[PDB]
């Protein structure tokens, strides 16, 4: 219930060669909503976004520490992060607190720096790697989002259809959930651009 203390919903699927990642925007205590413009998808690279769900404080702290170590590594090494390396590093970060786990289940989405092959993965509060080709979801909306994705997702999607599918997924998974929603932010990472969009969702 600690991961549902603030609520959350994050997803990421794959297109033909592009990636769509989306998250809810509601932030607040278990009862009341404080802010409807909260950011939950953060850039770990030019072609790599990460979504975090769970306890908001743990979300922010994990994001800050991950950005810390990621920037340190990329300055020491001189190349943009590889998505597999970022996923392994964040999984190790979560595992370092095995007895003090961050109540967060993150997802990592983006493209290969050179191949542009779509990559998506998920973790848990301990940091279990979970690489699934079709889609990964996390948060309090887990069941609704899994049910949506396992029917709305198809392989080899164009960016526009990919955006439509993920937008419908978020809209129809948060409208049936009480501790999430109130606006959805969607990022579409294509080969040569990224599109950030806010869905016209029900604010309550």
């Amino acid at each position: 219930s600690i991961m549902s203390y603030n609520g959350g919903a994050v997803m990421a699927m794959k297109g033909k060669n592009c990636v769509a990642i989306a998250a809810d925007r509601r932030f607040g205590i278990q009862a009341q909503m404080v802010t409807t413009d909260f950011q939950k998808i953060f850039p770990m690279g030019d072609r790599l976004y990460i979504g975090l769900a769970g306890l908001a404080t743990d979300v922010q702290t994990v994001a800050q520490r991950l950005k810390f170590r990621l920037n340190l590594y990329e300055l020491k090494e001189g190349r943009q992060i590889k998505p597999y390396t970022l996923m392994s590093m964040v999984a190790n970060l979560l595992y370092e607190k095995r007895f003090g786990p961050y109540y967060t289940e993150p997802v990592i989405a983006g493209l290969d720096p050179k191949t542009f092959k779509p990559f998506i993965c998920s973790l848990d509060l301990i940091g279990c790697p979970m690489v699934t080709d079709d889609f990964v979801v996390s948060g309090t909306c887990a069941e609704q989002m899994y049910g949506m994705c396992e029917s709305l997702w198809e392989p080899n999607m164009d960016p526009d259809h990919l955006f439509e599918t993920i937008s419908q997924a978020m809209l129809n998974a948060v409208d049936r959930d009480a501790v999430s929603g109130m606006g959805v932010i969607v990022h579409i990472i294509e080969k040569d651009k990224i599109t950030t969009r806010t869905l016209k969702a029900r604010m309550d």
Binding site: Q64, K67, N71, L72, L75, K76
Partner: protein, 250 residues
């Protein structure tokens, strides 16, 4: 251990400190580093000594590193001390970024480095880091700003400064040919080429002998660009053309 200690962290009878003096002398015979400021950016000119044909030279820069998102550095002296210093600087800069969610000001990071270097000279019984550091960067409070630090732990803010051989001649050239407040990127680059050609007259200006870096502020974003070999060749050609024109007019 009394007889066999090196006691490098004590005073001297005349009040100086031999270890930092020797470090400064070693830096003096070490490679050449130059830092300058322009109205739209700051430029770095670093000279690489080991230029054997066996080098893979795959690295973007040898003595020039990137401390953080909006600040670059140039090292002078021992390159391993340079590497450990640079990654410590990156670590603490990212620490400030984590703690405050704001890019670390250049003065902050230079002050922290000078603190740790002075402490390392103060005690510990170890030989001090014999590397001079020349930092450039952009910040919210002062924008383009560059500092020169010393192994003794002292730092200073300069519009333009150089370290290495013929440091006095280089700073004299800057004082003679730097237009304060009216130095554009092109004229600053030309002055940097002049210094690189003059402060190291032996083994006259060569493309692979030096590396050139620039730091600018475009669209509220700090861009650090390392000039390629073709760029350095263009600088050499421009310097030769301007020197020939000046001599012909003379």
């Amino acid at each position: 251990s009394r007889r066999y200690d090196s006691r490098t962290t004590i005073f001297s009878p005349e009040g100086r400190l031999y270890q930092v003096e020797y470090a400064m002398e070693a830096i003096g015979h070490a490679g050449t580093c130059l830092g300058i400021l322009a109205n739209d950016g700051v430029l770095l000119a670093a000279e690489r000594r080991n230029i054997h044909k066996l080098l893979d030279e795959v690295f973007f820069s040898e003595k020039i590193y990137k401390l953080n998102e909006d600040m670059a550095c140039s090292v002078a002296g021992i390159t391993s001390d340079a590497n450990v210093l640079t990654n410590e600087l990156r670590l603490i800069a990212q620490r400030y970024l984590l703690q405050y969610q704001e890019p670390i000001p250049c003065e902050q990071l230079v002050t922290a480095l000078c603190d740790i270097k002075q402490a390392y000279t103060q005690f510990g019984g170890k030989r001090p880091f014999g590397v001079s550091l020349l930092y450039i960067g952009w910040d919210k409070h002062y924008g383009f700003q560059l500092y020169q630090s010393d192994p003794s732990g002292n730092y200073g803010g300069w519009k333009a400064t150089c370290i290495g051989n013929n440091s006095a001649a280089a700073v004299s050239m800057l004082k003679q040919d730097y237009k304060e407040g009216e130095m554009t990127l092109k004229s600053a680059l030309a002055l940097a080429i002049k210094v690189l050609n003059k402060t190291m007259d032996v083994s006259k200006l060569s493309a692979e002998k030096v590396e050139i870096a620039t730091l600018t502020r475009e669209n509220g974003k700090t861009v650090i660009r390392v000039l390629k070999q073709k760029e350095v060749e263009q600088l050499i050609k421009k310097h030769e053309e301007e020197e020939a024109k000046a001599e012909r007019e003379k």
